[PDB]
Each structure stands twice: as C-alpha cells, then as structure tokens.
Symmetry: C3
Subunit: 320 residues, 3 copies
C-alpha cells in the first residue's frame, strides 16, 4: 500500500524534476538596435559662468554597438574643452589647497588628482591657492553632474534585442524572435511578454528604480533572458522569460565611485598645438544575461534514476 | 545469463557515457589577429551625383580589437560628410512627405527619422516637400548599400584565433595552439582541421552562405570551438573542434533591421563650426563561441553509478 | 561492523561532496574603475632621427571602459603621424627589397605588407630599393617597441573591481563588496584577500612574470574570481577567491604575433588633404573570469543519493 505510494511519489519526482531528460547548457549570441533621439536645451555652469547646452543627439551621439552582451546609453555629460599638455594649478579640493610651497612636493601623485605635481603652490582664483601640476590643462572641474540629466529623454528610447541560442549536444538552434510575429509592439509584463521591443523607462519601472535618478549619475541595469527548454515531443516548450534586475550597487559613496561614468577623450590640433577635449560621460549600461537549460530524454539517465529508485524499493520493503 | 549481459551493458553505459569521470565546465579566453588589406575603386551616387570612392583599407581602417569574444570586419559603407547641428528638411520617405504645414507637428519624433520636427512643411528638391526637422544637417540619405560591397575583398582576409582554456577544479590549463606547430597553414575541414588560421570566405563556404551577399548589408557569423577533454591516463584527448554557424536571422524585412550595420560618428570643427561625419557601417561580426567539458575519474561518481547499478542487479534478479 | 563503517564512509562522501545540495551555475557582471597616471619622458628614434617623447597620460589617454568582462591598459606605443593615401616605397624588409622592376608585380599583397604593390621598384633610402605600394603613406616602420616601455609606471596603476553575482534558480543575489567595508586597502594574498583594490605590479608578481617585460610588447593577463557558495543555514559561506593567471602564450615568435598590440587610427584633415595617424598600441589586457557554483539542499538529490547508497547496502551485505 504505502510502497506503491512511495513509487508513485518517486515517479512524480521523476516527471517534475525531468530526470528522464538530459540537461545541456545554452549557447547565446545577442544583437541589439537602439532607436530614439533626444533634444537637449539646458543651462550648465562652467567655471562659474552660466552657459547654454543645446544640441540634438541621435544614435551615433549617445551609443555604440554592443560588445560582450552589453550596450550603453549615455544620459548625462560634463564637457571640458581645450585641454593641452602643460602646467596648471589643480582644481580646489580639500586635498589640493596649499598654504605655501612646502605643501606641494614635486612628483607627487594623488588618486583624485589627474596630474603630477611640480612642487609649487600657486593661485587658482583670487587668493585661493592650489598645488601646481603637470597634466592636461586646465584640469576638469570637481563638479556634480547636471541636476536634470541632459539626456533625460533616454527613458523613452527603445532597445530591440535579437537573441540566438544553440544546444550543440542536442543539435538544436532557435532564435528569440519567431518568424511571422508582429514586431510593432512594446514589451509588457502581461500584455506582450514575448515582444522583444523594450522601453528603458519600462525596464526601470519593473525593477522599481526611477530612471531619472539613475540617469543623473549613471548606473548598470541588467536584462535577464531565461530559457526553460523541453525537447521530447510528448511535451514541448522553449521560449524566453524576460526579467529585469538593477546590477549596480547603489552605494552613493564618494570613495567607491558610484554610478556609471567614464572619461572619454577627443584629440585634435589647434594653432599648431596638440589639444584634447575631455568628456565625462554618465549613462546606463545594460547587460544582457542569457541563461538556459535544455533537456532531452536520455536512456542512461532514466536507467540511473530507476537504479536509485529500485534500491529505495527493496530497502523500503525492509523498513516496513 | 541475461543478468551478466545486463551488467556488461550497464558497464558499457558507464564507459561510453564516462560516468566514472567528473565533468567540469571550461574556461575560455580568446585573442584574434586579423591580417589582410583591401583596395577600393567604386562609383557611388551621392544626392543624385555620381562619385568615385577610391582608397586603400588596412587593419586599422576596417576593424578594431576584439571585445567579448567577438570581432568585427567592415565590408560596406555609406559615408555622409559635413553634418552640423541645424534645421533641414527630412529626407523624402512615405512617412516624411508633407502636403502643407498641417502635416508637420512641432516636436514630433519618428522611429525612422533622425530629427525632431519644427512643425513646418518645406521643399527638399523641386516641388517635393518634406517636414522640416532639427538635427544633424543634412539628413543621411535613405539609400541602399552599394550593390557590390566596397570591401568585397573581405572574404580573402585571414583571422588568427588563439584560445586559452582552463579547468580550475582539475587545475589543468591548455591553449588552442600546441607548441612547435607549423603555423603557416589555412584551415580546412579535412586537410588542416587543427590549423587556427581561418579565411572568411572559407568560413562562409562551410556554412553555405555566399560571402558577398552577406557583405553587402552585413551579418553575424559564429565560430564555434568544441573541447571534448578526457583526463585519465588510460585514455586522453583534449583538442578543439572548429565548426561554423551563421548567427544572424536573415529576415530581410525593413521592420526588423536586417543584416549588421551601425552609425559611426567622426566629429571635427570647420570654419569655427562644430561638424560631424556620419558613416553607416556594414560588416560581418564574428562571435567566437567556446564550450567544453572536462572529465576526470571521481571515486564518488563511480561509486554512485555502482550504487544505481547494483539495485538494478537485485531488482533484475527479482524480475526473472 | 564493516557495514556500518561503509555507511559512515558513504555519508562522509555525502557531506564532503555536498550531494544533499543542488548545484547551480553562477551569473556574473563586472564593473572596473582604473585609477592612476603616468608621466612619459623618453627618447625614441623615428626614421633614424632621435626624438623626445614627453607627455602626461591619464585615464582617458591609456584605457577605455571594460567590455566583455575585460579591460585594457596601454603600456607602450609607436606613433606614426601624417599618413595620407598615396604611393610610397614599402619599408625595407627581407621580403620588400627589390633589385629591379621584375621583383615587383602590380596588385601583389603580402601578409606583412600594408599596401598593394604597383609593380615598380623604387628607392627608399640611398641606393636601397623597395617595391612601390599604394596605401597610407608613408608606411609605418618595421621597428621594435621602445626598450623601456614608455608607460613603465603602469604597474603602479590601481584597478577597482566590483562583481555582482546571481543564482536565478535559488533566487539569491550578492555582490563582490560587502556593505560597510574599509575600501581603502591594497589587495594582498594574506593581508587583504577580500580587498577588491588591485595593483597591476602585485598581480604580475603573484603569477611570477615581470611587469616590465610584458609591458614592452604587451600581454594578456587574467584575473580569476572563484565563488564557492553554500546556501543551507547549518553552514554558510559565499565569498570570492581571487587568483591570477597569465593568459598569453609567451611564444616570442615573429610568425605568431607575440604579445598584445593593435593598430589604432586617428583620422584628420590637413591642408585640404585626408590624413591619418597610425598608433601601434602595446598594452596588457586583463580578462576578469568569474566562475561559481551554488549549492542548496534539494530533497530529490538527497533521496537519489540515498537510492544509490541503499543498493550498496544490500549488495554490500551480499558481498560479506
Ligand atoms: C517620453 O515621451 C512622452 C510622450 O511622448 C512624454 O510625455 C509627454 O510630454 C509632453 C511634453 O514633453 C506632454 O505634452 C504630454 O502630455 C506628455 N504625455 C504623456 C503621456 O506623458 C514624456 O515627457 C517623455 N519623457 C521624457 C523623460 O522626456
Ligand atoms: C581573393 O583572392 C583571389 C586570389 O588572390 C582572387 O582570385 C583571383 O582574382 C584575380 C583578379 O582579381 C584573377 O586574375 C585570378 O585569376 C583569380 N584567381 C583565383 C584563383 O580566383 C579573388 O578574386 C579574391 N576575392 C575577392 C572577393 O576579391
Ligand atoms: C611605483 O611607485 C613607487 C613609489 O611611488 C616607485 O618607487 C620609488 O621610486 C622613486 C623614484 O621614481 C624613488 O625615489 C623611491 O625611493 C622608490 N620607492 C620605492 C619603495 O621603490 C616605483 O619606481 C614606481 N614604479 C615604476 C615602474 O615607476
Ligand atoms: C561617440 C561619443 N558621442 C558623442 N556625442 C556628442 C555629440 C555632440 C555633442 C556632445 N557633447 C557632449 C558629449 C557628447 C556629445 N561625442 C564624442 N566624442 C560617445 C557616445 C556614447 C558613449 C561615449 C561616447
Ligand atoms: C576606425 C573606423 N574606420 C574607418 N575606416 C576608413 C578609412 C578611410 C576612409 C573610410 N571611409 C568610409 C568608412 C571608413 C573609412 N573610418 C572612421 N572613422 C572603423 C573601423 C571598423 C569599424 C567601424 C569603424
Ligand atoms: C584613446 C586612445 N589614447 C590615446 N592616448 C594618447 C594621448 C596623447 C598622446 C599619445 N601618443 C601615443 C599614443 C597615445 C597617446 N591616443 C589616441 N588616439 C587609446 C587609449 C587606450 C587604448 C587605445 C587607444
Ligand atoms: C542537426 O540536425 C539537422 C536536421 O536535419 C541536420 O541537417 C544537421 O546535419 C544536424 N547537425 C549535425 C552536426 O549533425
Ligand atoms: C500589430 O498589433 C497592433 C496592435 O497593438 C495592430 O494595431 C497592428 O496592426 C499589428 N500589425 C500587423 C502587421 O498586424
Ligand atoms: C596545478 O598543478 C601544478 C602541477 O605541478 C602545480 O604546480 C600547481 O601548484 C597546481 N595549482 C594549484 C592551485 O594547486
Ligand atoms: C608548413 O607546411 C607547408 C606545407 O603546406 C610547407 O611548405 C612548409 O615548409 C611548412 N613549414 C615548416 C616551417 O616546416
Ligand atoms: C526572491 O526572494 C525575495 C526575498 O523576499 C523576494 O522578495 C523575491 O520576490 C524573490 N524573487 C522571486 C522571483 O520570487
Ligand atoms: C582602513 O584601514 C587602514 C589600515 O590599513 C586604516 O589606517 C584606515 O583608517 C581604515 N579606514 C577606516 C575608514 O577605518
């Protein structure tokens, strides 16, 4: 009585855990196309002077093709133009202010300084003095990102994701998009869960984080694609499950370099002088993470499960 | 009789499926060097005027170092020079043609338009009128890629692939290239299946897709490296198997952004005006996919297989 | 007697190999921030003339953001300025020297040549003659990298690594850095093995390879992050293990393209002529490899182990 029930329960553990099947890791390749533009009219303070930042930003202006299953979209920026190699006083900071030449030692390097000191204490503005350095001059300001993200419209951008997956051992290949589907759609958790077209603001709403806040100083968001794939015939299902998870740590600590931002350089020549424009770029990197398991009935696996089950059979008969 | 045969068959399932061994996922790192150049003499129509595109393209002109186990080779391009921020009529399309100002609404954005409308209907050429937009002017043409790919010689290029793999649990490391091998070789399915030097046209012949067709509008090809690795001593083999699979979907639908292409921007300054050159790049991205399993005799695994087998022993004795 | 001992030993194989638990592959995302600068005063020979290379190199000058779980740091460079499309004699090499026009065939391409020949034998310097080619002129020298790496200070640079990992099946996420930790630290094998801050020279000392030697011609180093993660409650541990392994092959053979180096192009316009500056970049690419296994008690797994163990029970009783 109880033994045929132990057998039916163990068989349930077979069918549910799909141990008659063999599991094979998935192979994924990703291709994304970003669509959308943003118009930028804003007022940014450079060196204590108000300035008007106005420009139209298209695809080539705020992104470049994905590498390593991840793409980036710039949302804010601080542009420092005209840097040329030379000597200049470092930007005023608690570390950089100097009372006299004794505070500056030639050759000193600081993790928060972009230049090597010359050992002299010189004026920056009025009577405030900082330590003179040798680097790209003038030094970029120690200034916060614009309070509204210059590319605030970034949440309205649209990312199109095409994912190809293969299982070599089972020799089975399929793609994220099935042929003949109505591509004109915006992904929704319930209305269009197979629609590959994503809107960034929708993504940030799913994970619960406000897009604008992350867009001011950048972040790392993650798009997850699950593939529970069954290859039997008696039952079949091998389609993706889109989830969204915010990857960045959200420390908000000046020591841990919070948000996502980097220093992009644009070199040129002017008046027979080598010059550089340093752009501090703030944006959200999207990591596309694909993980899948493919099961297909293996005779050896089913026989091994049977082998672990008939021992519980005999021993179960001994236990009663 | 039949029972010793069931034992020999189960032992065959052991030796064949290598269950006395433990399986460990592979760790891969890739390094590719692309060699080859292409001379380009062609005739391309810009704004209804015939032009001569002539130039020599070396490594730095059509590729950049691999990131994320994938490298790209440009094969075709459409170059739009002199773009500067301003107001211009959008390029004539079924969506962009306007009969009067009522058709243009200020601030409108279109997925196929690269600019924000100003709300005015202005002439583009002759009496044909399109909606005026605010963006990088003039707008790139809506034009097909050159009928012969400008970099048609791309199939003759040579990619050299060096792959390092490690198994941490077994502490075993090996590389794609064994020391002392004759590197001067071109990979062939039978003549040189271990030769790492690949020719792109050969790759496209293996997968059966014509190189030129894909090169006109770009594509995503995939190089697969298999590692069936055995670590025992009684038998040993741990070398790669090169296969080739075309990753792109080949939709050929204007709604799904077919082929592989992106918008690359080159910013400069001219006559004290901020200017931009937009190059639409068409090329084949090669994804190097490495997947391997490393087996090495584990006593616990063999004992567990024995444990599943002796139950089939006793129960098998009961079945007769 | 011996049978209860076989049971205690098999139970030891259970607890040690953690087969009551289920193993799940790890999901990793990486974010690195490189800090440090380098001052460069050196003397490099261009075209047989001594020159002084002097410049200050910050983050934007020697690196760009990581893609595909790997970042690059330039350590040496050879800069060829002023290239424009045209005809020039190829640089003197055993392959390129020509006695007369019969040695040059028009349209010939060489794996070590950057241009297509025109079929004429012309002088390069004095009476030495090479084959005239059509390419970016003049051709970059066939010259060794500077004997001291121009960016020798690269070993003093600091890489900060933040790693996020997730197990979907168990729904458990954790990050490389625990909240509240003293970030100001330099990683040491024993003193600070959890400290994420790495120094490149320390990395190269751990693997035993001198930083400078690799920095002259570039290399591929690999940072490994292990995650042995236990999710039970009766015992718990899920933290990373940092190891370092040198990925490049160290062939030192001119045929196999040794070290890590690539050709980076900077296009500009001068005197109404399209021009290019070709920089041969030498540096160390760091591949961040994250691999982890997450175990959590699965009832079906423990029951399957029991099923393989009770058969060894009965059969063991038969063996005595
Ligand atoms: C994203 O786009 C939507 C709609 O295109 C913007 O919302 C509209 O904003 C305009 C003015 O900017 C208003 O006149 C409309 O009434 C708004 N409609 C809705 C439904 O909100 C939205 O502001 C855009 N997002 C960002 C960040 O700019
Ligand atoms: C790839 O290279 C081969 C040989 O270098 C090219 O084939 C030759 O083309 C030339 C003229 O271009 C002919 O004179 C030869 O007779 C051809 N030989 C062979 C064996 O085909 C081939 O055209 C190149 N591929 C591309 C796309 O340019
Ligand atoms: C890395 O930095 C260290 C210390 O900042 C350098 O070592 C010092 O070098 C200076 C001169 O360059 C000497 O005056 C000091 O006595 C040295 N101190 C120590 C502890 O070595 C080191 O040279 C730098 N590495 C490179 C490659 O430049
Ligand atoms: C290619 C580059 N985009 C750039 N876009 C701008 C175009 C006009 C004005 C700008 N002003 C400030 C900042 C940017 C821009 N400029 C450069 N270089 C880029 C894109 C994405 C991520 C990093 C870098
Ligand atoms: C670095 C860049 N290559 C570029 N190569 C050209 C060199 C001369 C003329 C060209 N004309 C049209 C198009 C290209 C070129 N030009 C730029 N910028 C590149 C390479 C590979 C993939 C994307 C981009
Ligand atoms: C962005 C670029 N860095 C560049 N840094 C230099 C700055 C001043 C003088 C230089 N001279 C020689 C060589 C380099 C430089 N120059 C360019 N382009 C780069 C960075 C990292 C890896 C590849 C390329
Ligand atoms: C995979 O299956 C298809 C289906 O017919 C077959 O054409 C192909 O050759 C198979 N691949 C391999 C490597 O056997
Ligand atoms: C796609 O679906 C939308 C409904 O959201 C519909 O309006 C549209 O016509 C559909 N497209 C096609 C080609 O059927
Ligand atoms: C791996 O094996 C080699 C072979 O001797 C040994 O030198 C090395 O220390 C081993 N690695 C570890 C981490 O034990
Ligand atoms: C490599 O093999 C080729 C045969 O295809 C041969 O001509 C060449 O000499 C070999 N190289 C060496 C170094 O033996
Ligand atoms: C994962 O566990 C947390 C812990 O409460 C829970 O809030 C979350 O919803 C879980 N995720 C899923 C997908 O169930
Ligand atoms: C971090 O540790 C160092 C010791 O190496 C110590 O000097 C420093 O004060 C610590 N930082 C904090 C915030 O406690």
């Amino acid at each position: 009585i109880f033994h045929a029930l132990v057998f039916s329960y163990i068989s349930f553990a077979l069918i549910s855990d799909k141990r008659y099947q063999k599991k094979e890791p998935l192979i994924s390749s990703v291709h994304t196309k970003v669509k959308g533009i943003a118009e930028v009219k804003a007022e940014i303070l450079e060196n204590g002077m108000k300035k008007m930042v106005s420009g139209v930003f298209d695809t080539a202006d705020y992104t470049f093709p994905l590498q390593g299953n991840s793409f980036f979209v710039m949302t804010n920026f601080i542009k420092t133009e005209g840097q040329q190699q030379g000597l200049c006083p470092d930007f005023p900071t608690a570390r950089t202010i100097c009372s006299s030449d004794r505070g500056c030692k030639k050759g000193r390097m600081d993790p928060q300084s972009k230049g090597i000191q010359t050992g002299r204490c010189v004026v920056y503005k009025e009577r405030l003095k900082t330590c003179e350095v040798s680097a790209w001059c003038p030094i970029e300001e120690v200034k916060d990102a614009p309070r509204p993200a210059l590319l605030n419209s970034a949440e309205n951008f649209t990312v199109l994701i095409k994912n190809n997956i293969d299982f070599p051992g089972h020799n089975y290949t399929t793609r994220n998009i099935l042929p003949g589907v109505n591509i004109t759609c915006t992904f929704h958790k319930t209305q269009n869960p197979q629609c590959p077209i994503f809107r960034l603001g929708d993504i940030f709403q799913e994970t619960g984080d406000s897009f604008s806040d992350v867009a001011i100083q950048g972040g790392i968001m993650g798009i997850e694609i699950y593939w529970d794939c069954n290859l039997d015939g008696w039952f079949h299902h091998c389609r993706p499950k889109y989830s969204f998870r915010r990857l960045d740590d959200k420390t908000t600590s000046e020591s841990l370099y919070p948000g996502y931002n980097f220093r992009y350089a644009k070199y040129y020549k002017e008046n027979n002088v080598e010059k550089r424009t340093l752009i501090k770029v703030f944006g959200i990197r999207f990591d596309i993470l694909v993980f899948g398991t493919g099961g297909k009935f293996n005779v050896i696996q089913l026989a091994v499960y049977i082998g672990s089950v008939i021992s519980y059979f005999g021993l179960a008969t001994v236990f009663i």
